[PDB]
Chains A and B, each alone.
Chain A
Amino acid sequence: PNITNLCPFGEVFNATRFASVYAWNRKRISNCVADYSVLYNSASFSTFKCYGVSPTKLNDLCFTNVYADSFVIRGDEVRQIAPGQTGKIADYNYKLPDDFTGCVIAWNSNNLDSKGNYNYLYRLFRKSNLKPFERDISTEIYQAGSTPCNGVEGFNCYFPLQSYGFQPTNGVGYQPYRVVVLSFELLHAPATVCGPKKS
């Protein structure tokens, strides 16, 4: 067919503001045909990591129920976003199941989030790990003992969140990085989003 429908992945990848990790932005994309070659063929995306499918056959295959997750983190922990890893961000702010069928894109945003900047938070204390793709939103005074403290912080009473000092003059690993994680299912339903067909 002459004209093929397309969905705006650009606005996802080109947005003024992103959500913090402890409240990760989740979006659903359906009923479109979006080329995937233009992504890994670019140079701005510093990290294009995924194993379940090669970049070459991204456009070859067709998928269903495309979900996108967006947030901003510190650089030195970009490794923690992978199937089956631990860490504060990998346990209390976001979870990635090992049986993951998707791909990961990460790139620097030093000149977009710098001063300095303080408005940045993430979950520090939580009861235990999270189920896959869980959204962990809450506000409670976690207690490191048995004495019950409520209302105000005190001894052994800790604030669940913490901010990030994204100074414009930081080195590698401390500059904020923007991360987009794409997930989907392999046509478990009638096809919704396929690759671009050649002519």
Chain B
Amino acid sequence: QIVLTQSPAIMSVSLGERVTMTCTASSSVSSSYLHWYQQKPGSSPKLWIYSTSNLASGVPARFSGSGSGTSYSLTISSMEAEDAATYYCHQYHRSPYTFGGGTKLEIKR
């Protein structure tokens, strides 16, 4: 199988700016099989960005990103108070299904 690796472990990034996050793998997975959930603390994950380009319901068109091959990028526009959550990479192409390493997104005052 292919293990999903996240280049940054945690982002202690202040409020307002615009950064990017990366999902890296040992080989290309698909143009559109991967997706990202959002596990809130003490809750269940929810999917926003599917097909590596499209967006699920409830997204204010603020969360975006693009990529293909062995590395994919997910971008933001401007940080706000509700961005303090968790994100998980995914891959559905091989027999075995794995998840991303995860990033503990946090804001700084």
Interface positions of A (Cβ within 8 A of B): 88, 116, 124, 153, 158-159, 162-165, 167
**Residues of B contacting A: mostly:** loop
Closest to B29 in A: A165
Q: Are A158 and B69 in contact (CB under 8 A)?
A: yes
Determine whether B108 belongs to the interface, using a CB cutoff of 8 Å to chain A. no
Q: Are B92 and A153 in contact (CB under 8 A)?
A: no
A124-B68, A153-B69 known; A162 vs B95 contact (CB < 8 Å): no
List chain A residues, Cβ under 8 A from B95. Answer: 116, 167
Determine whether B109 belongs to the interface, using a CB cutoff of 8 Å to chain A. no
A116-B95, A159-B28 known; A165 vs B69 contact (CB < 8 Å): no
A to B CB contacts below 8 Å, 22 in the list: A88-B31, A116-B95, A124-B31, A124-B68, A153-B69, A158-B68, A158-B69, A159-B28, A159-B68, A159-B69, A162-B28, A162-B30, A162-B31, A162-B68, A163-B30, A164-B30, A165-B30, A165-B33, A165-B92, A165-B93, A165-B94, A167-B95
CA distance A18 to B31 in the complex (A): 22
Closest to B92 in A: A165
Closest to A169 in B: B95
Interface positions of B (Cβ within 8 A of A): 28, 30-31, 33, 68-69, 92-95
CB distance from B28 to the nearest CB of A (A): 7
CA distance A159 to B30 in the complex (A): 11
CA distance A167 to B33 in the complex (A): 13
CA distance A153 to B28 in the complex (A): 12
Closest to B66 in A: A144
List chain A residues, Cβ under 8 A from B30. Answer: 162-165
CB distance from A146 to the nearest CB of B (A): 17
Across the A-B interface, give the 6 residue pairs with the lowest CB-CB distance, nearest first.
A162-B31, A165-B93, A124-B31, A158-B68, A162-B30, A158-B69
CA distance A162 to B29 in the complex (A): 9
List chain B residues, Cβ under 8 A from A153. Answer: 69
Closest to A122 in B: B31
CB distance from B93 to the nearest CB of A (A): 4
List chain B residues, Cβ under 8 A from A124. Answer: 31, 68
List chain A residues, Cβ under 8 A from B92. Answer: 165
CA distance A135 to B13 in the complex (A): 49
Interface centre among A116, A124, A153, A165 (most CB of B within 10 A): A165
CB distance from B70 to the nearest CB of A (A): 9
List chain A residues, Cβ under 8 A from B28. Answer: 159, 162
Closest to A159 in B: B69
CA distance A128 to B30 in the complex (A): 21
CA distance A153 to B69 in the complex (A): 10
CA distance A93 to B51 in the complex (A): 18
List chain B residues, Cβ under 8 A from A162. Answer: 28, 30-31, 68
